[PDB]
Amino acid sequence: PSRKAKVKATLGEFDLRDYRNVEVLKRFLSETGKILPRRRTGLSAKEQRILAKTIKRARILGLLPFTEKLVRK
Amino acid sequence: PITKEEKQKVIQEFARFPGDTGSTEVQVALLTLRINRLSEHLKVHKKDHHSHRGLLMMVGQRRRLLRYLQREDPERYRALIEKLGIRG
Amino acid sequence: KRQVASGRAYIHASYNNTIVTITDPDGNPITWSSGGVIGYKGSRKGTPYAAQLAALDAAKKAMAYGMQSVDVIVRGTGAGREQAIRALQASGLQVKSIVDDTPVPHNGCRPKKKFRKAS
Amino acid sequence: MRRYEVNIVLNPNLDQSQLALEKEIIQRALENYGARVEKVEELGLRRLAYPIAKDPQGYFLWYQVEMPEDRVNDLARELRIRDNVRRVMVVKSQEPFLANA
RNA sequence: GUGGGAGAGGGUGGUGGAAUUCCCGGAGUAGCGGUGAAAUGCGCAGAUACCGGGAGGAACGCCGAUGGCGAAGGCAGCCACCUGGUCCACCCGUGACGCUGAGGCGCGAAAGCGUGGGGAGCAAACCGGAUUAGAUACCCGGGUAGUCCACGCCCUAAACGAUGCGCGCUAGGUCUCUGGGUCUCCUGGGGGCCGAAGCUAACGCGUUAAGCGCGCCGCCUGGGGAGUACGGCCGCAAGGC
Ligand SMILES: [K+]
Ligand SMILES: [K+]
Ligand SMILES: [Mg+2]
Numbered sequence: 001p002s003r004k005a006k007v008k009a010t011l012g013e014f015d016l017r018d019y020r021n022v023e024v025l026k027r028f029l030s031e032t033g034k035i036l037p038r039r040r041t042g043l044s045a046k047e048q049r050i051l052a053k054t055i056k057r058a059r060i061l062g063l064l065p066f067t068e069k070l071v072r073k
Numbered sequence: 074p075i076t077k078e079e080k081q082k083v084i085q086e087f088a089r090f091p092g093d094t095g096s097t098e099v100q101v102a103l104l105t106l107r108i109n110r111l112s113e114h115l116k117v118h119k120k121d122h123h124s125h126r127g128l129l130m131m132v133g134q135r136r137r138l139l140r141y142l143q144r145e146d147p148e149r150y151r152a153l154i155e156k157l158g159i160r161g
Numbered sequence: 162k163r164q165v166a167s168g169r170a171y172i173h174a175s176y177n178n179t180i181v182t183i184t185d186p187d188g189n190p191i192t193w194s195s196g197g198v199i200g201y202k203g204s205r206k207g208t209p210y211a212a213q214l215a216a217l218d219a220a221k222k223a224m225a226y227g228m229q230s231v232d233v234i235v236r237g238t239g240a241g242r243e244q245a246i247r248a249l250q251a252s253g254l255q256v257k258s259i260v261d262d263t264p265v266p267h268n269g270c271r272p273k274k275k276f277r278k279a280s
Numbered sequence: 281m282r283r284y285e286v287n288i289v290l291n292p293n294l295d296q297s298q299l300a301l302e303k304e305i306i307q308r309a310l311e312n313y314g315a316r317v318e319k320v321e322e323l324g325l326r327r328l329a330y331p332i333a334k335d336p337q338g339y340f341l342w343y344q345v346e347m348p349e350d351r352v353n354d355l356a357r358e359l360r361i362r363d364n365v366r367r368v369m370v371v372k373s374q375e376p377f378l379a380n381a
Numbered sequence: 382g383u384g385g386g387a388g389a390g391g392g393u394g395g396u397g398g399a400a401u402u403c404c405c406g407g408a409g410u411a412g413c414g415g416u417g418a419a420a421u422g423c424g425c426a427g428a429u430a431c432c433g434g435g436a437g438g439a440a441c442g443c444c445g446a447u448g449g450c451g452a453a454g455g456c457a458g459c460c461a462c463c464u465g466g467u468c469c470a471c472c473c474g475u476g477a478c479g480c481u482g483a484g485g486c487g488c489g490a491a492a493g494c495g496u497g498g499g500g501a502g503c504a505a506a507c508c509g510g511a512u513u514a515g516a517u518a519c520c521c522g523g524g525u526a527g528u529c530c531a532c533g534c535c536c537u538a539a540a541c542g543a544u545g546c547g548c549g550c551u552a553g554g555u556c557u558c559u560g561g562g563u564c565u566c567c568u569g570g571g572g573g574c575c576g577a578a579g580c581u582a583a584c585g586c587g588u589u590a591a592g593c594g595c596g597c598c599g600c601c602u603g604g605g606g607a608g609u610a611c612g613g614c615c616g617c618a619a620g621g622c
């Protein structure tokens with residue numbers, strides 16, 4: 001479980017409240033559109049809690065996927 | 074909602090002297106403010122009970138403060154009611 | 162009577178059966194097969210071996226249309242899902258990719274009592 | 281009055297004239313509902329993560345505004361009256377919350 | 382009071398994607414489904430599997446936790462509006478204004494009731510298939526009320542922490558959520574676990590007491606008969622107290 005590391009560890013200083021930023025947000029989703037758990041995100045309680053919101057917003061806007069297809073099954 | 078200039082307006086209206094914030098008159102005034110606003114909110118939204126509990130609590134607080142004021146100085150009490158136009 | 166030669170292969174696998182459709186690039190099917198398409202009738206349709214036979218039958222019928230390479234897409238968890246994929250790779254059809262498209266609701270509809278303790 | 285952000289996603293297949301038209305209509309509704317535009321960002325055509333109205337792309341508009349909140353919902357409703365307007369999302373503005381600070 | 386904070390707290394209106402069902406179209410043909418195994422059932426009036434479109438209802442995957450909010454029941458897609466509670470910092474204002482609370486008033490899961498809508502999925506009753514010594518049931522196929530909305534009732538529960546509310550006092554340790562700070566750590570408010578003293582019949586509780594105390598409320602006095610009978614009050618009824 002979470003064998004590479006820390007999505008937060010590799011990234012710059014970024015706004016968690018920017019739902020309009022696809023580049024940064026796409027890193028917090030798995031292969032499927034699923035939002036990564038805390039083990040993977042490396043975030044904190046309210047950090048994660050905010051990220052979920054902004055991601056869901058971006059999904060509504062059409063910038064991020066709700067779900068994806070898995071490859072090489 | 075209740076903004077800051079509104080609240081400050083009512084505070085400086087019922088103050089007993091410049092600087093007074095928490096005297097009984099001012100508190101009864103603020104409670105009357107919040108109660109009126111909230112009851113207006115409950116005129117529609119009849120199905121919001123969780124706020125209605127708040128209304129009960131605010132009314133309770135106002136009535137206890139007024140009970141105190143009536144007990145202490147009946148003149149300030151009559152004055153307060155005549156000013157706000159409560160009870161009845 | 163097509164000459165498709167490149168297409169899609171849908172493996173839909175439940176616990177009770179495995180049905181394999183093979184389609185043109187636009188998704189319109191060409192040939193299909195299943196546990197019941199081969200001899201099996203009862204519970205044996207949900208077998209991995211029946212899944213192998215189904216995949217192979219479907220692929221044979223597909224290469225009859227002059228099919229060569231397919232993109233495999235899998236829906237469902239059941240025995241002989243993977244065995245269907247394996248038969249398909251071994252079929253002589255070139256498998257360009259495998260994908261799990263298996264549908265899941267995001268808490269949509271009430272399941273049958275068998276499937277309860279879920280939503 | 282409060283500070284908002286209006287996200288608008290339009291038809292990428294629009295030509296110049298009709299696009300200028302839709303933008304004009306947006307401006308007019310915005311003004312008519314009492315909004316002042318502090319900043320506007322036109323991102324242009326962008327790739328959606330999934331089709332909206334059959335189309336893989338969308339035309340993005342962003343308007344930071346100030347306005348009489350009691351009139352907000354209506355504005356959004358108004359913005360969605362147009363056929364060529366695919367998405368409208370109005371958001372209460374917020375101070376940026378940074379990680380890696 | 383001023384200045385900040387977190388939150389599925391409540392109400393109204395919007396809106397998003399996944400899925401299910403049904404309908405239209407394309408392509409395709411001999412089955413699908415379902416079980417321990419089957420049969421009913423559905424399919425040559427072309428099903429299942431695949432693609433595109435449409436209609437409609439209901440619930441919101443990941444995030445999601447050993448988490449948060451609420452007095453309780455309970456509360457989870459996203460957006461806005463309306464609104465309740467609460468915590469912290471400053472130590473600014475009032476000056477005992479406090480606690481509890483029989484009655485009263487209000488809130489109160491699910492099922493149920495009334496009127497009108499709505500009805501995709503699920504499904505009491507019912508109708509079928511099977512299993513069985515028999516099968517009423519378990520298992521399988523259908524399936525009405527109901528489940529959803531509005532308004533009005535009903536007032537219950539393992540309405541559970543099986544632990545009434547408030548305040549003061551009595552070792553620590555460890556994880557956690559949320560504020561503040563001279564930010565390795567100290568300080569405040571929550572949520573957990575191990576444990577001092579002590580308590581307990583034991584199990585266990587142990588600064589989130591079941592410890593040491595004070596105040597006020599509710600309650601108990603062997604089991605069955607029985608939460609029955611009678612009476613009263615409430616309810617449209619079921620029924621409740
Ligand atoms: K009890
Ligand atoms: K801090
Ligand atoms: Mg079978």
Ligand SMILES: [Mg+2]
Nearest residue numbers: 250254255256
């Ligand atoms: Mg191959």
Ligand SMILES: [Mg+2]
Nearest residue numbers: 360362363365
């Ligand atoms: Mg529109």
Ligand SMILES: [Mg+2]
Nearest residue numbers: 389390391456
């Ligand atoms: Mg809420």
Ligand SMILES: [Mg+2]
Nearest residue numbers: 398399400401
């Ligand atoms: Mg749909």
Ligand SMILES: [Mg+2]
Nearest residue numbers: 405406407427
């Ligand atoms: Mg058809």
Ligand SMILES: [Mg+2]
Nearest residue numbers: 421422423424
């Ligand atoms: Mg027949």
Ligand SMILES: [Mg+2]
Nearest residue numbers: 410425426427
């Ligand atoms: Mg025929």
Ligand SMILES: [Mg+2]
Nearest residue numbers: 403436437501
């Ligand atoms: Mg219908």
Ligand SMILES: [Mg+2]
Nearest residue numbers: 454455490541
């Ligand atoms: Mg509960």
Ligand SMILES: [Mg+2]
Nearest residue numbers: 464465466467
């Ligand atoms: Mg608030």
Ligand SMILES: [Mg+2]
Nearest residue numbers: 095472473474
């Ligand atoms: Mg002082």
Ligand SMILES: [Mg+2]
Nearest residue numbers: 096474475476
């Ligand atoms: Mg003094």
Ligand SMILES: [Mg+2]
Nearest residue numbers: 480481482546
């Ligand atoms: Mg009390």
Ligand SMILES: [Mg+2]
Nearest residue numbers: 129485486487
């Ligand atoms: Mg009363």
Ligand SMILES: [Mg+2]
Nearest residue numbers: 489490535536
């Ligand atoms: Mg009830």
Ligand SMILES: [Mg+2]
Nearest residue numbers: 491492493528
């Ligand atoms: Mg009900």
